[PDB]
Symmetry: C3
Subunit: 253 residues, 3 copies
């Protein structure tokens, strides 16, 4: 039986919106260790993954490894149905055909219960990460998101080129071309605005615009974003959070 | 001759928007006692009524019971044409074919006059209210509006079930089902957040989604909303204001 | 070689949006004296003009009178691609086929360079202004813009009638008619809210709605707007700024 209780429902809503437009119909898996999720879009180019630890809740309980597939559009349609200041509780049992979400106010004057009919999803999972990549950077999520949104207006292709102490974003389309160049710096005044880069091998990889625009929707989850790039493996974007992370994998071109 | 003068035009704008999407082409009637209005939509399921007393104005004057039918879309198209900090004055005469609206600033540097061509509306009125119903509740308008908006995403049918110290809102659709349960409580810390219920007979009535979504547009008129429900009579939603009220009547199913 | 450097990019963005929906594909001309621009829409009814002096920049440099035609939609698509707190630098050379825009942050951690492919525009210019008109007024830009937006809902024709100490705006359509009357006053409490009028000959001219709605988009450029009206010459709307101005010319009816 699954009895999870978030401290606040806002976290779960933001997490769902972090890859809502990325992939739909994600098959979560709940264990006694935490909640994970892995999904691939219809085009099979983006691999989105979720990990939520026990510490992200004020009270978590589980006694059966359950697998729960549901529609992200309908799930987000339900997640907006609770007063944001209330507390959210996920409820499921052994071999279920629906998941139940309980919204409770502090003094229990109102109680909202929503039942969501599940979906039959093929239980397939993918593990492709390694310990080190050709280059590894970390930059503020808002800055990276604005960079992507700026370059998406020019073309449907965004190139990233990383050399020693140099990160470059190129985009060439019909109306013209654009280039954003950032350099690593460990600023003492503000550590969060600092861009960090570890350089092992130069990188020059082209990605799509739509997939990055959907990826950057996890900007509300973290202040920073960590990108791992290698010539052989897919680019790895990662947003960290309180005992958990969202991890997108995008194949270059 | 009708010479009404609101203290501020914002009240009239909000009142028009309280049932703007409810019913269009409402035939107001102005007497020396106040301004009332009654309208039915094309489907003839929703009966919307308005009552505005003399105290809602800083200066009211009338000497002839005039009847004035006009388009709510065009009326709202005109009501946005005055500086909100100015004062609004309704002007009409005996047997008129247009109504004149006068917007005046405090120091009279600018004067805006708008003439609205009226509509020929059949003078029909309906009085169906009684003193007591099977159950009578009153709850904050924002809470009720959010409840309706939350349940409208699931289905086009919203059931309300009232039992002793229990108000329940059910909605079952394709993606799933939802239930919001509130209990009466007279909270001392905040009297406005208190939900009040008088129980004479149990109620279990299903209503539409679109009509309730249009009804709840009078949430800007009052902090609370009073709902009267009986098995025989149509459900009565009411928003009170400064010497007046908006009153919608919706037929169950 | 053209090397202009705005104090802030916000000014240039606002200036482009001041006539963005007015005319597209405007052919700027840069001299060692300043930057000017003149454009006519496809209908050839609105003549939009721009003048930007050297003092509008913190650092301007030029050694060749260059002529630069570009698309306003694409230019505005690029102007949103720089962090608003950064500084913008226009770069061009002798006989160019593209213009380069440089966005620089204060500490130079990031540098954004955008290349815009130019357009071949016939170098035609028009000078039609004179020193005096039949009537000349100046009123707050926000007030005038709201007046235009209020009257645009009634009809596609907005008449302006100016007599001694009387400015009137008429608009008669299907649903009705509207009239906004403002009077000149030199208010001591607030000089900016004052409306000023110099009266030499009475004016009664009808203009379009769409063209005025596009003209009033320069409301973000100035607190006030100066209108010059004569029976013979086109109406002249003007927004002033820090060493420069935007000047639209609209033909009456």
């Amino acid at each position: 039986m699954l009895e999870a209780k978030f401290e606040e429902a806002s976290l779960f809503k933001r997490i769902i919106d972090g890859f809502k437009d990325c992939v739909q119909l994600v098959n979560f898996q709940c264990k006694e260790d935490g909640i994970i999720a892995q999904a691939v879009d219809d085009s099979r180019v983006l691999l989105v993954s979720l990990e939520i630890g026990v510490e992200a809740f004020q009270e978590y309980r589980c006694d059966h490894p359950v697998t729960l597939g549901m529609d992200l559009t309908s799930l987000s349609k339900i997640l907006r149905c609770g007063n944001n200041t209330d507390t959210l509780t996920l409820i499921a049992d052994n071999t279920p055909d629906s998941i139940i979400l309980l919204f409770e106010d502090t003094k229990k004057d109102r109680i909202a219960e929503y039942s969501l009919k599940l979906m039959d999803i093929d239980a397939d999972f993918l593990k492709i990460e390694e310990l080190q990549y050709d280059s590894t950077l970390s930059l503020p999520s808002s800055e990276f998101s604005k960079i992507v949104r700026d370059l998406s207006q020019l073309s449907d292709s965004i190139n990233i080129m990383i050399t020693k102490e140099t990160i470059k974003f190129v985009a060439d389309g019909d109306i013209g071309s654009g280039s954003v160049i950032i350099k690593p710096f460990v600023d003492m005044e503000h550590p969060e605005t600092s861009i960090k880069l570890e350089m092992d091998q130069p990188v020059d990889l082209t990605f799509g615009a739509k997939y990055l625009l959907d990826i950057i929707k996890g900007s509300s989850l973290s202040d920073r974003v960590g990108i791992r790039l290698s010539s052989e493996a897919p680019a790895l974007f990662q947003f960290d959070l309180k005992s958990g992370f969202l991890q997108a994998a995008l194949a270059p071109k």
